[PDB]
Amino acid sequence: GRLIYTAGGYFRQSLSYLEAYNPSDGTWLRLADLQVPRSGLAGCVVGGLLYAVGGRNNSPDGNTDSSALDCYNPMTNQWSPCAPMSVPRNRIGVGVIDGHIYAVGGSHGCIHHNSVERYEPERDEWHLVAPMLTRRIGVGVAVLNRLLYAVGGFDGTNRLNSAECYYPERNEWRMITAMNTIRSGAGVCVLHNCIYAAGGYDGQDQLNSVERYDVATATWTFVAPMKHRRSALGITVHQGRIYVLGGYDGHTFLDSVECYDPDTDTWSEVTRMTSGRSGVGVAVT
Ligand SMILES: CC(=O)N1CCC[C@H]1C(=O)N[C@@H]1COC(=O)c2cccc(-c3cccc(C(=O)O)c3)c2CSC[C@H](C(=O)N(C)C)NC1=O
Ligand SMILES: [Cl-]
């Protein structure tokens, strides 16, 4: 029994919701709220524990970028603060290699990070690794073949279609084949040995197109687009299918949850979140 967890998000302000969807029965569980509301965060799982990394708390009073790492234990329904990152990272990308969390790019006020840092749960420590070749906020991150890919985003001047790859044993980055579409705020994940980039913002419009990167051929190929255009969507893989949760379509904050079946190349609306929101952190455990 694995659930799709959605943490935080944004609807008029940053949210503290932690909710879990069971794809087997269509139920949503209302779990313990985050101690501090956040949007632009990312979720991940290490050893059955859920992590909420970075983001920003936007309130009608003022906004605060987060360098926080918080840990949720599904067995206790309790959040526990962990060591914070070296810098606040809003609109962050996260990836897990060998039970180590990589926090990629993101923004802190006027700053757009190229810096990347790694968290070791067993030591409760963060350490900087080699920075990316490009500054990237709203960056999609995927782990494939024990390599950490940074896909698209925004370098502070332009939205990007470029993508790069990190070699943890060598501690270095290399640019890979760029996507067909410029995407900032896309949902990036790996399914069946392919990296998928769904939705995002091309600098003018929110996207519904979805493309996948094949490593053997080094080519990005378009697959069936989602029914709803969305940027700042949450994304995860569950039982061989991609799930996209919420997002922003340019006017409204989506509650729509779509599911991609790779065997039939089709998307379908599987459920709706309890309320519309963008900038959620998603993970499965
Ligand atoms: C103008 C603006 O962005 N805002 C002013 C008040 C605070 C802030 C505000 O509304 N943010 C909330 C939160 O959104 C995310 O968490 C979030 C999380 C991850 C990625 C992205 C993302 C997507 C596309 C491109 C880029 C890129 O970096 O180029 C980044 C976002 C921003 S989605 C845009 C939408 C918006 O602009 N309006 C006006 C509601 N913003 C949001 O949903
Ligand atoms: Cl924001």
Residue numbers in the entry: 325 to 609
What does the published report state?
The Kelch-like ECH-associated protein 1 (Keap1) is the substrate adaptor unit of an E3 ligase that regulates the cellular concentration of Nrf2 by promoting its polyubiquitination and subsequent proteasomal degradation. The nuclear factor erythroid 2-related factor 2 (Nrf2) upregulates the cellular defense system against oxidative stress by mediating the transcription of enzymes acting as antioxidants or being involved in detoxification. The C-terminal Kelch domain of Keap1 binds a high-affinity ETGE-motif and a low-affinity DLG-motif in the Nrf2–ECH homology 2 (Neh2) domain of Nrf2. The Neh2-binding pocket of Keap1 is large (550–780 Å2 buried surface area) and contains three arginine residues (R380, R415, and R483) which interact with glutamic and aspartic acid residues in the two Nrf2 motifs that are essential for high-affinity binding.
The m- and p-benzoic acids 63 and 64 were included in the set to target R483 and R415 via salt bridges, and m-benzoic acid 63 had a potency comparable to compound 1. The Keap1-bound structures of compounds 60, 63, and 64 were determined by X-ray crystallography at 2.2, 2.3, and 2.4 Å resolution, respectively. The meta carboxylic acid group of compound 63 forms a salt bridge with the side chain of R483, just as the para carboxylic acid of 64 which also forms a hydrogen bond with S508. Both oxygen atoms of the carboxylate group of compound 64 interact with the guanidine side chain of R483 via a bidentate and coplanar interaction. In contrast, only one oxygen atom of the carboxyl group of 63 interacts with R483 in a less preferred “back-side” geometry. Moreover, the other oxygen atom points toward a hydrophobic pocket formed by the side chains of I461, F478, and the aliphatic chain of R415. These structural differences, together with the additional hydrogen bond to S508 formed by 64, are most likely important for the >50-fold higher affinity for Keap1 displayed by 64 over 63. The orientation of R483 is almost identical in the complexes with compounds 1 and 63, whereas it has undergone a significant adjustment in the complex with 64. Interestingly, this water molecule has been displaced by the substituents at the ortho-position of the macrocyclic phenylene moiety of compounds 60, 63, and 64. In contrast, the observed entropy contribution is considerably less unfavorable for compounds 60 and 64, and even somewhat favorable for 63, while the observed enthalpic component is reduced as compared to 1, 2, and 39.
